[PDB]
């Protein structure tokens, strides 16, 4: 007759639900060994600047956590019409941030702390608004912890100081960002 036939379906649902959420979630955004180089450099410049190994650890952990959750949401079509448009603006703004970070190193002395703070904060606000309907307070805190550290004016000025400890880090960071850009991952 009619065995419990539903189970072959949620299973079909479960089967592919997984198919788009977990794979891309980590197979694609962070396990990209180049993403890890960039994150490692972000760690080093933060540790170098804060003189605190565990405050630097927490910044990068917050960042990695945010990116993953963001990916999973996206791949799961949990975003509505307005969150997708926001996400698309976010991606454009991060692309522009990435190229501006590089250009401020590649073109001598064009570093402008206000341009970078404006772009970083625009990313920050985009992220808050994207996750507003789907994440809790902890995630908003992670977003602020990450962007508070990187948009810090004195942090930015030191990172682009060509005479100090940070010069070789900026060079490595830029190599990594450019690699992501060239692979079209950002
Ligand atoms: C030194 C001063 C500035 C330092 C920067 C501090 C770092 C904070 C800034 C930005 C956070 C980066 C988050 C990137 C999110 C990318 C988009 C995303 O998460 O969604 C996913 C994107 O999917 C991808 O495969 C591409 C992005 C995955 C890698 C991004 C995560 C890397 C983590 C470290 C990146 C650092 C960026 C540095 C920028 C200056 C899912 O959407 P999609 O449909 O697959 O992509 C559509 C395009 N076909």
Numbering used by the authors: 13 to 198
Text lifted from the article:
Although members of the tumor necrosis factor (TNF)-alpha-induced protein 8 (Tnfaip8/TIPE/Oxi-α) family were originally described as regulators of tumorigenesis, inflammation and cell death, we previously discovered novel regulatory functions for these proteins in autophagy. In particular, Tnfaip8 inhibits autophagy in an mTOR-dependent manner under oxidative stress conditions. PE binding in the hydrophobic cavity allows it to form a ternary complex with Gαi3, mTnfaip8-PE-Gαi3, and to mediate insulin-induced anti-autophagy.
The crystal structure of Tnfaip8 from Mus musculus (mTnfaip8) was determined at 2.03 Å resolution. Except for 12 flexible N-terminal residues (Met1-Ala12), all other amino acids are defined in the electron density map. The overall shape of mTnfaip8 resembles a water dipper. Its cylindrical domain has a dimension of 48 Å × 31 Å × 30 Å connected to an N-terminal grip-like domain composed of 20 residues with a length of ~35 Å. The dimensions of the hydrophobic cavity are ~20 Å in depth and ~7 Å in diameter at the bottom up to ~10 Å at the entrance. Intriguingly, two long electron densities were found inside the cylindrical domain of mTnfaip8. hTIPE2 and hTIPE3 also contain similar densities in the cavities of their cylindrical domains. As the most promising PE candidate, PE 34:1 was selected and modeled into the cavity because the known major FA compositions of PE from E. coli are C16:0 (36%) and C18:1 (31%). The PE-bound model explained a potent functional role of the three positively charged residues, H86, R87, K103, near the entrance of the cavity. These amino acids are next to the phosphate moiety of PE.
